[PDB]
Write a protein that binds this ligand. Structure first.
Ligand SMILES: COc1cncc(-c2cc(F)cc(CNC(=O)c3cc(N4CC[C@@](C#N)(C5CC5)C4=O)cc(C)n3)c2)c1
Ligand SMILES: COc1cncc(-c2cc(F)cc(CNC(=O)c3cc(N4CC[C@@](C#N)(C5CC5)C4=O)cc(C)n3)c2)c1
Ligand code: PRO
Ligand code: PRO
Ligand SMILES: [Ca+2]
Ligand SMILES: [Ca+2]
Ligand SMILES: [Ca+2]
Ligand SMILES: [Ca+2]
Ligand SMILES: [Ca+2]
Ligand SMILES: [Ca+2]
Ligand SMILES: [Cl-]
Ligand SMILES: [Cl-]
Ligand SMILES: [Cl-]
Ligand SMILES: [Cl-]
Ligand SMILES: [Zn+2]
Ligand SMILES: [Zn+2]
Lengths: 488, 486
């Protein structure tokens, strides 16, 4: 690793994600290879989220990757938003197809004709379905690995309810699960909010979101999203059922959709990584502990070296007995300093050093990757202390990022205050009228050199909006404190 | 209740059963089908078994892009020539024509191997063992059939690269018996391990191994899983080369395998075990292993009954038996019987008021319909017993069929007779592509011709020395399994 994270964030990021062997570049731009080191993180997130939504009654399934032209168009706001980046398959071989078919940018228009077929009565609701699949949004803007890509992996959940209340309840349950993914799995603090009218999902009624802050770049990013679509899709696809209390009254299903993508890993990189490379939260780390033999003096007896390799394997089995994911790196090819650096780059939480003296002093050394602190631990305590230390790394990482967010998110009540705070690389909760025209005016007059976008309306703002407060536009009364910033 | 009869109209029976069991929904684009939860759970059961197994072998999961460049797509010529007609091309985003068309993967050799070339520099960088669960597209214009032959399907594809040929060779057989376990221990389907002929092998591979299942209802056989030794065919083309100090200055080409298994599995399960009442789920893969159904339906009597049902539910979740209590009051018991029979749940546990008061219940096996009265005591015992017995039963009934329908013939006269019987045939075979073409042509001439299925590792007989191929002109190389196929 050669570029410094605070000097050039993009070069740093690219260096870190490739040299940790998370990402390989592919010869089609905006498409990247998820190598096992990153895919294992996606799999940990999947293990957690899948079990949680199972408890909520959601079931997994798989819908086709192709959308017909007429299905894609039924909900005009939604297709108006997505149409410019829909990839169209037009031949197979040199044989033109009968009709162009589109690759799913999002599966509402794939799934909801099916929903309409399956909802025949109030007993068929609710329908709670989820799929883990890939989608394509073929924008021409510059792509960025993990954060903004042309193909990405994700989950998308789609549910249909008889009543608005059960649907509004699910929206928030899911959004809290996303917050749990970011905060408990990835040790990333997030702000829960609602999108403004301009930023909400096209076709939906309201969008709830979690926002993360990346202090290196001073910019925020959406980490997850949970929409209430209301009846805007069920009216276009005729997902209908007869009202049970009133005969012949056809009702339209109330719908939500919600998605979470591999953006998660990029945020985890941008937030925790440092100038030695990746830093993996223990809860998602592929390897949690790497055992590395040191000493190896060359005047060591064959008896001594064989006994040290033995002791390393004793540690390995020890840690496996208590469910710690542990790799012993007993390769004679590379030097110990080499391996130290190699596993630091990948961000293994703990490096476990065993050397001939500590080996017979009944102890070993643990090195935390987050703080760099070396600890000497007696053999006896290993699995206990190591687990206590993995816990402490998780906490420590979360805490640091929280201190970042608390320091870098502040209130401002006028446009001048706002502009200067924003220009110090912070995000700002300002009083806002909610109007698209004023949001555009903000983005215009506030131009790391782009105008601020609205990021969300927090469920729990920093200040209480005082009666009669006017927006930053000055022309209209303010409706809510809203988090604004520069954005990925 | 099911309408069509398997032995009368197999295609209609199949469509009826896959839709009414709520496995498949149709899509407005022909050739693509919706896997609903009931089918997807079977896929996920296969997924869990196979994932654990290949992990013990040192394969890791990953995810490669869906799109291939023209340059990459053509670098190995035999492979590209075989797949090009069925490759779907993206040509525009929105109303914007792309400068270069790009292709959707029909298989991911040409996505993955340019990366393999960058990762390999020394023998220490080997082996590379990567697997991906993903979707592929093969846009063929023949008529699709759900699960069996679709234009989009889910699969796993494993790709391995090794410094030496012996390691590669070992892995091909390891993966192939994993596939055989998936079929024989999970879906209760017997299969034939063998080698593809030169006409049927993976284009640009060295050799292809395969497992074939037999579908007695149609009389046809189907490939179920595939494991290819690619040799150095692709690494020479994508320059996956390494230096090893044992052989100074020689750039050495990696030895490579690829291996794949698809949702076709589920369809073969359906074709093999389904009956005229609908799907029949093997206990090992069944989403729901036992469905508890309250029968009958005062109130203290009603409430007591939903409660004893929930009692059985908690007791069965205790012992990791996958169980549903269908306590919906908006559907009658008969409706529920029919519904879960259509979905093939292995065991129906009926609780009526009389037997609730008599500390007993009734278990009904889906595969034989046989009803058994059971004490409340043995619910965790006898049920676990019965499920196990159902699994073996499905397997043994399947095997009988295979062993009755797979026979030897050593002359074309016999071969044709037995083939028209609805059976599959092992014949002495020269191995040549022309002979195989001719077997197909004349077996249709004298409603489709027979194709080579595999060359069995363990044939039914051994070839007499000096014996001739069933064509007469060339010495037979091996016994080869022929038959009509999907
Ligand atoms: C908006 O101006 C841009 C600026 N700079 C670059 C681009 C751009 C460039 C490209 F080459 C390709 C693309 C297309 N991909 C994406 O837009 C995208 C969106 C998301 N999203 C959107 C919000 C969400 C959350 N939570 C949704 C739940 C899903 C989530 O994860 C995730 C990923 C990996 N990719 C965009 C666009
Ligand atoms: C043979 O002439 C035909 C006759 N009648 C119809 C078609 C046809 C019609 C379509 F509309 C679409 C297609 C394309 N899909 C497939 O070719 C295909 C192959 C496999 N395969 C191939 C062997 C394999 C195994 N084991 C390999 C591991 C992969 C395995 O599962 C599985 C599935 C679900 N689909 C074919 C073709
Ligand atoms: O694209 C989105 O944001 C929604 C959430 C998952 C499905 N579509
Ligand atoms: O397409 C096939 O059949 C082989 C096996 C999976 C990858 N390629
Ligand atoms: Ca630069
Ligand atoms: Ca758009
Ligand atoms: Ca000591
Ligand atoms: Ca072909
Ligand atoms: Ca050869
Ligand atoms: Ca040379
Ligand atoms: Cl077409
Ligand atoms: Cl909140
Ligand atoms: Cl058929
Ligand atoms: Cl129920
Ligand atoms: Zn305003
Ligand atoms: Zn011959």
């Amino acid at each position: 690793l050669e570029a410094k994270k605070e000097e050039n964030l993009a070069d740093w990021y690219s260096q870190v994600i490739t040299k940790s062997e998370m990402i390989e570049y592919h010869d089609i731009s905006g498409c990247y290879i998820l190598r096992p080191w990153a895919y294992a993180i996606w799999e940990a997130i999947k293990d957690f989220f899948d079990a949680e939504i199972k408890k909520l009654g959601v079931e997994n399934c798989y819908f086709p990757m192709f959308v017909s032209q007429s299905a894609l168009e039924k909900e005009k706001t939604h297709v108006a938003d997505f149409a410019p980046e829909v990839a169209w398959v037009t031949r197979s071989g040199k044989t033109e197809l009968a009709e162009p078919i589109a690759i799913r940018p999002t599966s509402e228009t794939v799934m909801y004709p099916a929903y309409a077929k399956w909802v025949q009565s109030h007993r068929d609701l609710p329908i709670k379905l989820n799929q883990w699949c890939n989608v394509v949004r073929w924008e021409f803007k510059h792509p960025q690995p993990f954060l903004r890509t042309r193909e990405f992996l994700w989950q998308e959940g789609h549910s249909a309810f008889a009543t608005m209340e059960e649907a509004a309840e699910e929206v928030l349950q899911i959004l809290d699960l996303y917050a749990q993914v970011y905060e408990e799995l990835l040790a990333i603090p997030v702000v829960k909010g609602r999108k403004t009218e301009k930023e909400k999902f096209a076709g939906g009624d309201y969008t709830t979101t979690i926002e993360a802050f990346i202090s290196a770049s001073g910019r925020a990013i959406q980490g997850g999203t949970s929409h209430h679509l209301g009846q805007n899709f069920s009216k276009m696809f005729e997902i209908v059922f007869e009202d049970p209390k009133i005969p012949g009254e056809k009702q339209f299903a109330y719908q939500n959709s919600w998605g979470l993508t591999t953006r998660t890993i990029g945020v985890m990189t941008m937030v925790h990584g440092d100038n030695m490379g990746l830093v993996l939260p223990p809860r998602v780390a592929c390897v949690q502990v790497v055992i590395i033999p040191c000493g190896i003096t060359n005047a060591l007896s064959e008896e001594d070296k064989e006994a040290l390799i033995a002791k390393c394997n004793d540690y390995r089995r020890r840690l496996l007995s208590v469910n710690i994911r542990v790799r012993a790196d007993l390769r004679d090819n590379y030097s110990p300093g080499w391996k130290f650096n190699h596993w630091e780059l990948k961000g293994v939480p703990i490096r476990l050093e065993v050397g001939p003296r500590d080996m017979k002093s009944c102890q070993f050394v643990a090195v935390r990757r987050d703080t760099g602190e070396k600890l000497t631990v007696a053999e006896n305590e290993a699995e206990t202390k190591l687990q206590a230390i993995l816990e402490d790394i998780q906490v420590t990482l979360f805490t640091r990022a929280s201190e970042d967010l608390k320091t870098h998110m502040v209130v401002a009540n006028t446009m001048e205050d706002f502009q200067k705070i924003l220009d110090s690389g912070k995000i700002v909760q300002i009083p806002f009228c909610g109007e698209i025209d004023c949001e555009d005016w903000i983005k215009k007059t506030t131009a790391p050199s782009m105008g601020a976008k609205s990021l969300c309306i927090p469920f729990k703002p920093l200040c209480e909006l005082q009666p009669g407060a006017k927006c930053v536009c000055g022309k209209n009364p303010a409706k809510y404190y809203t988090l604004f910033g520069r954005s990925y």
